[PDB]
Every structure is written in C-alpha cells, then in structure tokens.
Amino acid sequence: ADKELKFLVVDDFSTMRRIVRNLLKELGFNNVEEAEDGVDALNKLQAGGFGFIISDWNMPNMDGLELLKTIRADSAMSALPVLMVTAEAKKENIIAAAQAGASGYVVKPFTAATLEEKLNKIFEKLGM
C-alpha cells in the first residue's frame, strides 16, 4: 500500500488518537489526520483524499458502528477501508462489525506489529 495513504483516526480520547497516529508513523504512514467522533469524522472526510479509516467503537454524537454504516452506504465513500477498534472482543460486536462491512476488527490496546498485521490483512484483501 502507498506510504502516503491518508488515514483518518477517529476516537473521542485524544491520547488514544495520538497513540494510533504514532504507531502508524512507526510503520511509515505519516499522512494522518484526527477526528473526535463520527460527526467530526464525516466533516473532515468532506475535504477528500482520505484512503483509510481507523475508528473506535464508542463515541458520542455518532459512534463507530454508525460511522461505518454511513461510510458503507455513502455514494462516494462506500469502499473506503475501515478498521474498527474495540475495548473487548465479544461475539455480538464482532458480528455487528461483520454485518456492517468492517474491513478489519482489532482490540485495544494493540502493538505496532498487531496494527501492521491488521492493515496488511486489509491491503491484501483489497489488492492495495
């Protein structure tokens, strides 16, 4: 996948966003922006150019699942890669993610090596 792929990292917790941004940097992905919830994410997505989304499950105003479904049903953004982040792997949340078309699913906290595996799984499936 291109080193310059533009990521949007979505989480209401600023520290987690910084952590994810820094793990991405460690993997060679420097083109990264932040959003604090689904509403803020959709506003930033309007700038165009975004190539990858990493979103937390639980956020105010619009949570991760709502954002995922919105992107998937959007005329322009429907195929955008979306990695969902959760606090705990639960059958019901995994299946909710599957049903809505999550490109990936990962439990926080995660290492750079785990992030890399998950991104590579997605790149491989999408031929990126």
């Binding site: 995994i94 699913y105 799984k121």
Partner: peptide
C-alpha cells in the same frame, strides 16, 4: 466461546 470468537474472527478474515 473464546474459541468460537477466534474462529469467528478467522472466518471473517479479521
């Protein structure tokens, strides 16, 4: 159930 979860993730390519 842990194993149903890991299998579920595997089947989904997650």
């Amino acid at each position: 159930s842990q194993d149903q979860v890991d299998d579920l993730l595997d089947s989904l390519g997650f």
